[PDB]
Amino acid sequence: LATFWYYAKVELVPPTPAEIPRAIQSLKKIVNSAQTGSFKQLTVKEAVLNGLVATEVLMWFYVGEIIGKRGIIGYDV
Amino acid sequence: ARAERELKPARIYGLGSLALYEKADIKGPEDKKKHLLIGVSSDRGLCGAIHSSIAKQMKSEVATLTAAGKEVMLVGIGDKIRGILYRTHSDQFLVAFKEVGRKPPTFGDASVIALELLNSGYEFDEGSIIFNKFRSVISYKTEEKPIFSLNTVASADSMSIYDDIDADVLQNYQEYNLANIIYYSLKESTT
Amino acid sequence: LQSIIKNIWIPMKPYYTKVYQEIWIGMGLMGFIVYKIRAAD
Amino acid sequence: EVKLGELPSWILMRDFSPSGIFGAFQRGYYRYYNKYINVKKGSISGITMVLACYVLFSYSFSYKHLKHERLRKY
Amino acid sequence: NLFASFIAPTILGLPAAVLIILFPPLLIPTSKYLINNRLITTQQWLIKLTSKQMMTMHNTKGRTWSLMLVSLIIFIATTNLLGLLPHSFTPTTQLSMNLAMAIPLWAGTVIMGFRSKIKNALAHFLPQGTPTPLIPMLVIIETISLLIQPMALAVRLTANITAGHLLMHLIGSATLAMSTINLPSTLIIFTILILLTILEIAVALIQAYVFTLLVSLYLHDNT
Amino acid sequence: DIDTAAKFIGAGAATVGVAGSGAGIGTVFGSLIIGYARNPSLKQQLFSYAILGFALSEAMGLFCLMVAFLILFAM
Amino acid sequence: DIDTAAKFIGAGAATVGVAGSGAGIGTVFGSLIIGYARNPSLKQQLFSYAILGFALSEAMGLFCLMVAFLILFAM
Amino acid sequence: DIDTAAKFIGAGAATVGVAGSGAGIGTVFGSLIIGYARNPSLKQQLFSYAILGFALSEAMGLFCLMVAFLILFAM
Amino acid sequence: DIDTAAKFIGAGAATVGVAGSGAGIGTVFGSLIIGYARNPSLKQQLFSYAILGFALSEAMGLFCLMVAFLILFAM
Amino acid sequence: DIDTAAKFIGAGAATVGVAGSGAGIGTVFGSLIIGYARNPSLKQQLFSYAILGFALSEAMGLFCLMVAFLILFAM
Amino acid sequence: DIDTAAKFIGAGAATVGVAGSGAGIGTVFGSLIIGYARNPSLKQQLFSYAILGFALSEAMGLFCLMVAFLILFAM
Amino acid sequence: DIDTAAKFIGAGAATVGVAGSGAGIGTVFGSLIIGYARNPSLKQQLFSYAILGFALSEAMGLFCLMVAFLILFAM
Amino acid sequence: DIDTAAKFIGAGAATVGVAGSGAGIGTVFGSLIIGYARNPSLKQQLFSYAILGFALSEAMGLFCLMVAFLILFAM
Amino acid sequence: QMSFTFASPTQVFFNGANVRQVDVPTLTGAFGILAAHVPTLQVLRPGLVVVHAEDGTTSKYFVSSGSIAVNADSSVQLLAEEAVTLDMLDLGAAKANLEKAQAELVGTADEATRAEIQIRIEANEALVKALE
Amino acid sequence: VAYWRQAGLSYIRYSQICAKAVRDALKTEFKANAEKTSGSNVKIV
Amino acid sequence: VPPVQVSPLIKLGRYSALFLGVAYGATRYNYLKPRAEEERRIAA
Amino acid sequence: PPLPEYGGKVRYGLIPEEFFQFLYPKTGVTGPYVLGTGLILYALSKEIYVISAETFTALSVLGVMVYGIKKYGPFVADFADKLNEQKLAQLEEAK
Amino acid sequence: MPQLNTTVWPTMITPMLLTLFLITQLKMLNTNYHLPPS
Amino acid sequence: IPFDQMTIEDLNEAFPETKLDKKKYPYWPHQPIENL
């Protein structure tokens, strides 16, 4: 009912223009790990967790595609 | 004393047994030849005019039926009636019973009497029972009730309105009512 | 050959040897019928 | 066990024999059974999860017939 | 197109029908314990009730088939029940499995009735009080009946379950084609589909019990 | 074309088979009436049996309609 | 044309299926008569059941008529 | 012409459907006989129910005849 | 010619509809037997009802034969 | 000769109508069994009624056969 | 030839008429069961009546088969 | 070819005749239920009669199937 | 082509034969209702018999459907 | 409209009472009687007897044998030889006597004695089934 | 016609056996009094 | 239960991917519409 | 060995609380739910889950299953428990 | 009708026998009902 | 041992009456169906 918005105001909100430095900080962390090749230390539990978050943002992209074509089931044309 | 207390439910039950033949109005066959006559009394004496009344009614009805050619068979529930009737009426006699009066009559007594009336090979075309209907501590009256055979109840016209009726259910009902009327007579004659 | 015929064949022996014998004859008949079907097809 | 190990030789270290994979499936079955079914005051969810995985497996092999009833064309 | 749910399922080229037929026993765990969880409790209760409802009429020789008949009813019931799940393959819709379940059991029954019992076995082809001028005909009857008992078994499963399933499919299609048209009619068709699903559950259970009871009656006729 | 024509004819034929389920439902509910007139205290249970019978009888009828449409549209 | 001809034939065929609902209604109301003759005090309730049975039986019949018209006009 | 021919065939087919109303009327009046033999005092009321049943059964039959003529003359 | 042929076919079809009146007469007289075995004193009245039922059942049958001849000779 | 062909078809159709008399004779004699099991003393009279019913039921059946031959030979 | 096919069709049609004798035999033996459950002492006599009924019912059925073969081989 | 076509049609027709044996088996086992509810002590003997009836009814049905195949394969 | 057309017609015809199993199931469960209203203590056993009857009746019906598909797909 | 009379050789349960329904275990099956029920007369077998009073309450008794008569004036007479309220019976004695009677049945060989054994058997079976 | 009628019994005997079996299944709190109120003492001569 | 603020990289990825998805959906819609209509016309 | 008294805490009878408590650290509470919603939308948009008659048969069987559970779940549960307690009482009585 | 495709017929016959006659019966044999105590 | 950690074999050891007579009845359910 109304608890969904109670949580969404925390986590389902656009990122404020103040926290993008921390976003690119985490991005530079992960690209440093890719540069050194140290991602082998990440035990596969956290690797699976990161893969799940990646599929989550990929589903976000796909919901963007389905809202950007004004149709749910495939391309209406 | 106690019999006047045990009579009320016995009266209700016995008269409820005979409510059918009163509502359906079974009239009995006035053309048949075989007749059964049960007389209810006790084994004890000093009763006054009980056994004398029962014997007088049994003798009168035996005479009235034999005058019409009907072959009568007699039954006496009690030793007094058998003793009073055995001399003058010995050829006309089927079964007698004993040990009545010392203990109050129960439905076991009636079930017995009915059984040994049915396992006798005497298919009676009709019957009567003679007892002493109790009216008050001073007054009683020798009354008589009918006993219909299977063919009387089955061949009656007014029995056409009754349902799921065949010869088997009528046989069972007639046997149970023989027991019921014997029990009713036994409960009325002990007062 | 251990724990197979210990858990699969010992309990089923009284049934596979004496009780289901006519069942085995019927299975032979069924295989014969299925083969005669799949032949003419 | 996995979710803790980070070595690819583990993939070779495992017993890929008939008895090996048989014991693996049996261990998984007994783990599931003891976690969800082999408990007093148990739930129906321990069976509904199996039924849901079975419906997924059923939709898997029926996709080769279900891709011929596609609504769109792309 | 329409019968794509009765075609032998293949996943990655392998005959998944093997796994689909091997699954139903996986839903009946067993335990050496004396007091165990709710699933095995209810399942043991149901197995006892079924054994009592089926095996009571038999003599001591017929009650040796108790394992076989309880196993048969459990297998057929679980297969028919799992067959109601979406996109599932129901191996009792196949004439193969039903024929291979019906011919062996009926044939073993009649063979165990002919091995011993042979005089009473040949006598059962004639009712007791049959009149003389009707003796011969009423012999050519029974045998053909006795010859169509296995068929009538297998078909009675197949042609039932299949039909049921196909029905639930066709009506379903209706709902789909009715989605973009009158909505109250869509809801009415969907309620029809729900009632039909309930009927199909009842028919799955009843068909299992029917197959098992007919095999049991054949067995009692020869024991 | 002869295919559409015979599809119509076969649909009508397969539809004829609903008469038996009509008669069966009639018999089921008439017997229900009789059995309830005999032992009304069992009413609920009787009704249960009635429903079961109905479900099966009309089931057969629906099978007929199945074939009817299976000839009219699916071919 | 053969399509109209077979439409007539299939309409007649599908119409044949009303005989079963006729017989079912006959059975329902005959049983109602019998059950009311045994326990008239339940009359109203009996009639209720009768109506229910009728509704279902004729329902099947109407289904038949459905197919009849579905072949006669809708095609 | 094929239209007249199939009109004859479909009229015969639709006419076949009077058998069910024949059987239903038979059942209704047989049950009436039985129920009157059981409780003759309800005779009149029983007859009433009988009539009702008849009216419905033959109604279905007339529907069949309807379609028969609807194919034989109205087309 | 196709008209005579379909006239034969439709006459046979419309004739099929006498089966229901056969079954209805069977039911009527069987119920008459039962009800007379139950209350023979009502015999005459029972027979009366029987006749009535028969008259109606066979009536339907005759209607069928009507259509049969109406297709065989009147057209 | 489409005429001979349709004569065969219509003869078969008109022959179909003996099923109702078969069922009616079955019902008559089953009811006779029941009514005799109830009141065996009326046996003879019951049998009489049975015969009557049979005579009428099979009569209808013969009518069907009539039409069958009336299409097979008389035309 | 149309004359060599219509024989097949008419044989099938005339064969349809065995359903009534099937139903009649079913009714006869069911009533026999009921009447024997009522009065088992009459068993033999009951069975006699049963046989008679059967003989007549199946007789009608055989008549149907008669016509079937009379169209299939004798023509 | 017309021969194969009419073979299909006649096979379907001859198959129609199993409805009567279906109804007869239904009647037999329903009567068995009733007669066992009346006198359960005769159960075994009752079942015997039931089997007999079944054997005959389905026999007729098989005869129908006979003709069906006799037209479908043997010709 | 005439083969597909007659396959449709024969499938519809063979499907017609489910009416008898519909009526038989109706009769079985109606008798079950009656016999349970008479002797409810035998309920379970009665139900057993009912199931048996059902199994056989619907069996015949399935046979009909068998032939239906045997003409519709297997040829 | 229905005047009930339920009685025993020594006890009167009802007497001209106005009840709405009465269930009885007739030798030819069970049935429930209401007002204006078709007139009938039957003999009973061991079983329950449920009497529904107009207030919607049900009294349950157990009758061994006797007779029932529904009359044209909606007057019902139910006379039982031994009528006992349910709480006066116990299940263990019923089951034990049933087992004894079954044993004596498998043991006996004479026809009439076997019939009496069977009668007592069914009596005890109805006892157990009616109790619980 | 029940089985015991074929055996030669009578509804008096059936009723006796049934009432006896119902009296035996009484709890001992009532069994003595119920056997007393329903016993038989008559003797045939 | 107290909610938890998602890491900023995850939210930025979410919303950037969402906007890229809207853009890609519009682009492919406009790209497929002409060929779709042309094949619909050429089929007849 | 005695049996534990409770199972695995499955939400909606399909997903155990392990998944939600494992995804809670990085994506909060609505994380798993929005992941599932995105998965469903991507499935029924890219024609991974084709819509057909099986869709509505699936909805009907799922509705019947959920209704049967929600209706006769307490009955079956306390019935199994009562069977166990009856057996335990009988056994302890025989001790 | 795919039910008449006699090519995949063994694939249906073989596991059923492995399931109806061995596995399910081996699970039934482990369903033992002991005698009630005194 | 409490009755919730006891095996049917352990119960047969504690109460030798509860054993199933695998000699008079070798086939499942190792006992007559009425006692089941």
mmCIF file with all atom_site columns, N, CA and C in Angstrom, chain M residues 28-51:
data_model
loop_
_atom_site.group_PDB
_atom_site.id
_atom_site.type_symbol
_atom_site.label_atom_id
_atom_site.label_alt_id
_atom_site.label_comp_id
_atom_site.label_asym_id
_atom_site.label_entity_id
_atom_site.label_seq_id
_atom_site.pdbx_PDB_ins_code
_atom_site.Cartn_x
_atom_site.Cartn_y
_atom_site.Cartn_z
_atom_site.occupancy
_atom_site.B_iso_or_equiv
_atom_site.pdbx_formal_charge
_atom_site.auth_seq_id
_atom_site.auth_comp_id
_atom_site.auth_asym_id
_atom_site.auth_atom_id
_atom_site.pdbx_PDB_model_num
ATOM 1  N N  . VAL M 1 28 ? -26.048 -44.528 -13.249 1.00 0.00 ? 28 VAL M N  1
ATOM 2  C CA . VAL M 1 28 ? -25.249 -45.130 -12.183 1.00 0.00 ? 28 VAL M CA 1
ATOM 3  C C  . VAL M 1 28 ? -25.252 -44.242 -10.951 1.00 0.00 ? 28 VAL M C  1
ATOM 4  N N  . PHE M 1 29 ? -24.983 -42.950 -11.131 1.00 0.00 ? 29 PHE M N  1
ATOM 5  C CA . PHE M 1 29 ? -24.874 -42.099 -9.953  1.00 0.00 ? 29 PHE M CA 1
ATOM 6  C C  . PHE M 1 29 ? -26.235 -41.760 -9.358  1.00 0.00 ? 29 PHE M C  1
ATOM 7  N N  . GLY M 1 30 ? -27.291 -41.723 -10.170 1.00 0.00 ? 30 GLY M N  1
ATOM 8  C CA . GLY M 1 30 ? -28.619 -41.568 -9.605  1.00 0.00 ? 30 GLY M CA 1
ATOM 9  C C  . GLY M 1 30 ? -29.027 -42.751 -8.755  1.00 0.00 ? 30 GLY M C  1
ATOM 10 N N  . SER M 1 31 ? -28.743 -43.954 -9.259  1.00 0.00 ? 31 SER M N  1
ATOM 11 C CA . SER M 1 31 ? -29.037 -45.178 -8.472  1.00 0.00 ? 31 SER M CA 1
ATOM 12 C C  . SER M 1 31 ? -28.179 -45.170 -7.203  1.00 0.00 ? 31 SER M C  1
ATOM 13 N N  . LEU M 1 32 ? -26.926 -44.710 -7.309  1.00 0.00 ? 32 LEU M N  1
ATOM 14 C CA . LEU M 1 32 ? -26.086 -44.621 -6.118  1.00 0.00 ? 32 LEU M CA 1
ATOM 15 C C  . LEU M 1 32 ? -26.728 -43.714 -5.079  1.00 0.00 ? 32 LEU M C  1
ATOM 16 N N  . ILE M 1 33 ? -27.240 -42.562 -5.518  1.00 0.00 ? 33 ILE M N  1
ATOM 17 C CA . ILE M 1 33 ? -27.951 -41.663 -4.614  1.00 0.00 ? 33 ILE M CA 1
ATOM 18 C C  . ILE M 1 33 ? -29.109 -42.389 -3.942  1.00 0.00 ? 33 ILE M C  1
ATOM 19 N N  . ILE M 1 34 ? -29.916 -43.096 -4.735  1.00 0.00 ? 34 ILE M N  1
ATOM 20 C CA . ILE M 1 34 ? -31.093 -43.772 -4.186  1.00 0.00 ? 34 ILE M CA 1
ATOM 21 C C  . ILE M 1 34 ? -30.679 -44.846 -3.184  1.00 0.00 ? 34 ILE M C  1
ATOM 22 N N  . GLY M 1 35 ? -29.745 -45.713 -3.580  1.00 0.00 ? 35 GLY M N  1
ATOM 23 C CA . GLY M 1 35 ? -29.323 -46.793 -2.708  1.00 0.00 ? 35 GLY M CA 1
ATOM 24 C C  . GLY M 1 35 ? -28.628 -46.316 -1.451  1.00 0.00 ? 35 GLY M C  1
ATOM 25 N N  . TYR M 1 36 ? -27.987 -45.150 -1.507  1.00 0.00 ? 36 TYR M N  1
ATOM 26 C CA . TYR M 1 36 ? -27.401 -44.598 -0.293  1.00 0.00 ? 36 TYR M CA 1
ATOM 27 C C  . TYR M 1 36 ? -28.466 -43.969 0.591   1.00 0.00 ? 36 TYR M C  1
ATOM 28 N N  . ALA M 1 37 ? -29.483 -43.353 -0.012  1.00 0.00 ? 37 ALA M N  1
ATOM 29 C CA . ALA M 1 37 ? -30.599 -42.849 0.777   1.00 0.00 ? 37 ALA M CA 1
ATOM 30 C C  . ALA M 1 37 ? -31.333 -43.980 1.477   1.00 0.00 ? 37 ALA M C  1
ATOM 31 N N  . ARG M 1 38 ? -31.250 -45.196 0.933   1.00 0.00 ? 38 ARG M N  1
ATOM 32 C CA . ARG M 1 38 ? -31.963 -46.354 1.541   1.00 0.00 ? 38 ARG M CA 1
ATOM 33 C C  . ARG M 1 38 ? -31.133 -46.960 2.677   1.00 0.00 ? 38 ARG M C  1
ATOM 34 N N  . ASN M 1 39 ? -29.858 -47.268 2.430   1.00 0.00 ? 39 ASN M N  1
ATOM 35 C CA . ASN M 1 39 ? -28.994 -47.919 3.412   1.00 0.00 ? 39 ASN M CA 1
ATOM 36 C C  . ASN M 1 39 ? -27.678 -47.162 3.500   1.00 0.00 ? 39 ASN M C  1
ATOM 37 N N  . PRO M 1 40 ? -27.658 -46.030 4.207   1.00 0.00 ? 40 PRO M N  1
ATOM 38 C CA . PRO M 1 40 ? -26.429 -45.225 4.268   1.00 0.00 ? 40 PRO M CA 1
ATOM 39 C C  . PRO M 1 40 ? -25.258 -45.937 4.921   1.00 0.00 ? 40 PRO M C  1
ATOM 40 N N  . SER M 1 41 ? -25.507 -46.922 5.785   1.00 0.00 ? 41 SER M N  1
ATOM 41 C CA . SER M 1 41 ? -24.412 -47.614 6.453   1.00 0.00 ? 41 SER M CA 1
ATOM 42 C C  . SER M 1 41 ? -23.533 -48.389 5.480   1.00 0.00 ? 41 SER M C  1
ATOM 43 N N  . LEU M 1 42 ? -24.060 -48.768 4.320   1.00 0.00 ? 42 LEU M N  1
ATOM 44 C CA . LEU M 1 42 ? -23.285 -49.449 3.294   1.00 0.00 ? 42 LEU M CA 1
ATOM 45 C C  . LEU M 1 42 ? -22.570 -48.478 2.367   1.00 0.00 ? 42 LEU M C  1
ATOM 46 N N  . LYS M 1 43 ? -22.593 -47.181 2.698   1.00 0.00 ? 43 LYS M N  1
ATOM 47 C CA . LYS M 1 43 ? -22.149 -46.117 1.800   1.00 0.00 ? 43 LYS M CA 1
ATOM 48 C C  . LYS M 1 43 ? -20.889 -46.478 1.027   1.00 0.00 ? 43 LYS M C  1
ATOM 49 N N  . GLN M 1 44 ? -19.798 -46.755 1.744   1.00 0.00 ? 44 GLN M N  1
ATOM 50 C CA . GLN M 1 44 ? -18.519 -47.018 1.095   1.00 0.00 ? 44 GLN M CA 1
ATOM 51 C C  . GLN M 1 44 ? -18.656 -48.103 0.036   1.00 0.00 ? 44 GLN M C  1
ATOM 52 N N  . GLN M 1 45 ? -19.189 -49.263 0.427   1.00 0.00 ? 45 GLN M N  1
ATOM 53 C CA . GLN M 1 45 ? -19.333 -50.362 -0.521  1.00 0.00 ? 45 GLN M CA 1
ATOM 54 C C  . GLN M 1 45 ? -20.160 -49.933 -1.725  1.00 0.00 ? 45 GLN M C  1
ATOM 55 N N  . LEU M 1 46 ? -21.270 -49.232 -1.477  1.00 0.00 ? 46 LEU M N  1
ATOM 56 C CA . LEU M 1 46 ? -22.085 -48.725 -2.575  1.00 0.00 ? 46 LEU M CA 1
ATOM 57 C C  . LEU M 1 46 ? -21.235 -47.902 -3.527  1.00 0.00 ? 46 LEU M C  1
ATOM 58 N N  . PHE M 1 47 ? -20.489 -46.938 -2.979  1.00 0.00 ? 47 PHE M N  1
ATOM 59 C CA . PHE M 1 47 ? -19.633 -46.100 -3.808  1.00 0.00 ? 47 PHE M CA 1
ATOM 60 C C  . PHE M 1 47 ? -18.703 -46.953 -4.649  1.00 0.00 ? 47 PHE M C  1
ATOM 61 N N  . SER M 1 48 ? -18.144 -48.007 -4.050  1.00 0.00 ? 48 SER M N  1
ATOM 62 C CA . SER M 1 48 ? -17.281 -48.911 -4.797  1.00 0.00 ? 48 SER M CA 1
ATOM 63 C C  . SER M 1 48 ? -17.992 -49.410 -6.046  1.00 0.00 ? 48 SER M C  1
ATOM 64 N N  . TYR M 1 49 ? -19.167 -50.022 -5.859  1.00 0.00 ? 49 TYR M N  1
ATOM 65 C CA . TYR M 1 49 ? -19.941 -50.483 -7.008  1.00 0.00 ? 49 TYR M CA 1
ATOM 66 C C  . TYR M 1 49 ? -20.153 -49.359 -8.007  1.00 0.00 ? 49 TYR M C  1
ATOM 67 N N  . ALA M 1 50 ? -20.517 -48.172 -7.515  1.00 0.00 ? 50 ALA M N  1
ATOM 68 C CA . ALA M 1 50 ? -20.733 -47.038 -8.404  1.00 0.00 ? 50 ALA M CA 1
ATOM 69 C C  . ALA M 1 50 ? -19.522 -46.829 -9.290  1.00 0.00 ? 50 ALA M C  1
ATOM 70 N N  . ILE M 1 51 ? -18.345 -46.727 -8.669  1.00 0.00 ? 51 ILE M N  1
ATOM 71 C CA . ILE M 1 51 ? -17.118 -46.520 -9.428  1.00 0.00 ? 51 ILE M CA 1
ATOM 72 C C  . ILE M 1 51 ? -16.996 -47.576 -10.510 1.00 0.00 ? 51 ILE M C  1
#
